[PDB]
From a paper:
[name] transfers sulfur from sulfur donor [name] to substrate [name] by consuming ATP. The enzymatic activity of [name] is dependent on a [4Fe-4S] cluster. Only three cysteine residues chelate the cluster, leaving one Fe atom (hereafter referred to as the unique Fe site) remaining free from coordination by [name].
The manner of interactions between [name] and Fe-S (i.e., [name] coordinately bound to Fe-S via three cysteine residues) was identical to that for holo-[name] reported previously. However, a new interaction directly coordinated between the unique Fe site of the [4Fe-4S] cluster and the C-terminus of [name] was observed. One of the three [name]–[name] heterodimers in one asymmetric unit showed the electron density of the Fe-S cluster connected to the C-terminus of [name], indicating coordinate binding of [name] to the Fe-S cluster.
Residue numbers in the entry:
A (entry chain B): 2 to 173, 177 to 264, 268 to 318
B (entry chain E): 1 to 65
The structure:
């Protein structure tokens, strides 16, 4: 039964020794997010925050919660150009923004740079997910700097973060992983308010809220190693409630601080943070455009023009 | 009785009722940590009883990333 009111539970969490009905699960979820934010000092009260929103269950739940918590939450959707999946991701996200009267910023990858994730998986020399991850991270940070956001929030949850950690241990980086990454020059702060919530818990919130999210997974996701890691970790979790959270907390508090010093450079092309002379994003597009011209998918006299970091 | 599977990627199977959700999930080989079962607007827990006339939607909590 519900721990609060004693009525029938909608969500039982054995990991937390807690079961709740609809009303009280909704309150608890919002309050636990508020507590996660306060503890690690992720956001300032009422602050403008850029929420990276895919249309999936987590990032839409995050946009919902951050709005309810009084933050000024502007969504950013990137249209990655992956078939009908990307088309539906955009539609679902626009619909969410429309219904709630929220501001949604959109960057269309193909429209802006000429090529989407599927073309990148051919022309860039990288596999789909590699090109996609890089594009997402760069563009999200770019929009944040350009529009003057101090901080970006993404919907990464416990299973996501535990899987990354497990992956990093299975294939030895570690020290870079965290729920709060500090702001730098040309680099917005990055926070993960949902990092202590299991996927099941976020989904329960999303369903109980009546949030319309995209059920469909990306077609490129099947057979991903992250799924293998999550399956193994959830195998353990099933018979040992709380294991995932102890796993990630144990690493963050104990192991990570004892793991580790060069200043970030400034990209010659776009001026954004990098450890190279030209950042990975700009190098990717230079390689893509080169290969595209050879294959006659792009005009020879067309040149890649990056939007330079403002100052 | 009628169980709609996710993601769609649509999949539909059917099982016998009058038993806990815990039991029907084990038959389908589904890890309770990784899914949410929904009857109407109501989420079901492991102890909840599924009927022989019930229509369930089991939704994957697992994100492919
Ligand atoms: N197309 C996109 N546009 C903007 N932000 C995105 C996009 N895809 C992912 N993100 C951000 O990165 C985070 C991790 O994405 P991931 O691919 O792991 O899951 P997802 O498919 O986005 O589903 P969810 O929204 O449930 O996380 C998301 O929570 C979201 O904040
Ligand atoms: S799976 Fe996630 S990362 Fe790989 S392509 Fe589809 S979206 Fe981009
Ligand atoms: Zn209650
Ligand atoms: Zn650059």
């Amino acid at each position: 039964v519900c721990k609060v009111c004693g009525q029938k539970a909608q969500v039982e969490m054995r990991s937390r020794g807690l079961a709740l009905c609809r009303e009280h699960y909704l309150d608890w979820f919002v309050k636990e997010t508020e507590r996660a934010i306060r503890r690690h000092r992720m956001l300032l009260p009422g602050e403008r925050v850029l929420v990276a929103v895919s249309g999936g269950k987590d990032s839409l739940a995050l946009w919902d919660v951050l709005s309810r918590l009084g933050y000024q939450a502007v969504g950013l959707h990137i249209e990655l150009g992956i078939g009908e999946y990307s088309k539906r991701s955009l539609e679902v996200t626009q619909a969410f923004a429309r219904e709630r009267g929220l501001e949604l910023l959109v960057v269309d990858l193909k429209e802006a740079y000429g090529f989407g994730v599927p073309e990148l998986a051919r022309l860039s020399g990288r596999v789909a997910c590699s090109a996609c991850g890089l594009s997402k991270r760069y563009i999200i940070n770019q929009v944040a700097v350009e529009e003057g956001f101090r901080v970006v929030a993404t919907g990464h949850n416990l299973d996501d973060e535990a899987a990354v950690l497990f992956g990093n241990l299975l294939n030895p980086t570690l020290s870079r992983q965290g729920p709060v990454l500090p702001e730098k020059p040309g680099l917005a702060a990055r926070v993960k308010p949902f990092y202590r919530f299991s996927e099941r818990e976020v989904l329960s919130y999303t369903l109980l809220r009546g949030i319309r999210y995209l059920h469909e997974e990306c077609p490129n996701a099947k057979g991903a190693k992250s799924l293998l890691y999550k399956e193994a970790l959830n195998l353990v979790e099933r018979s040992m409630p709380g294991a995932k959270l102890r796993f990630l907390d144990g690493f963050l508090e104990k192991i990570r601080p004892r793991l580790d010093e060069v200043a970030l450079r400034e990209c010659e092309r776009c001026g954004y943070p990098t450890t190279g002379a030209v950042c990975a994003f700009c190098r990717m597009w230079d390689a893509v455009y080169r290969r595209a011209k050879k294959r006659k998918l792009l005009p020879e006299e067309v040149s890649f023009r990056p939007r330079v970091k403002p100052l | 009785h009628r169980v709609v599977l996710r993601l769609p990627e649509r999949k539909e199977v059917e099982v016998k009722g009058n038993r806990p959700l815990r039991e029907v999930l084990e038959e389908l080989g589904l890890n309770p940590e990784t899914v949410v079962a929904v009857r109407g607007e109501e989420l079901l827990t492991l102890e909840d009883e599924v009927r022989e006339e019930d229509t369930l939607e089991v939704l994957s909590a697992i994100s492919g990333g």
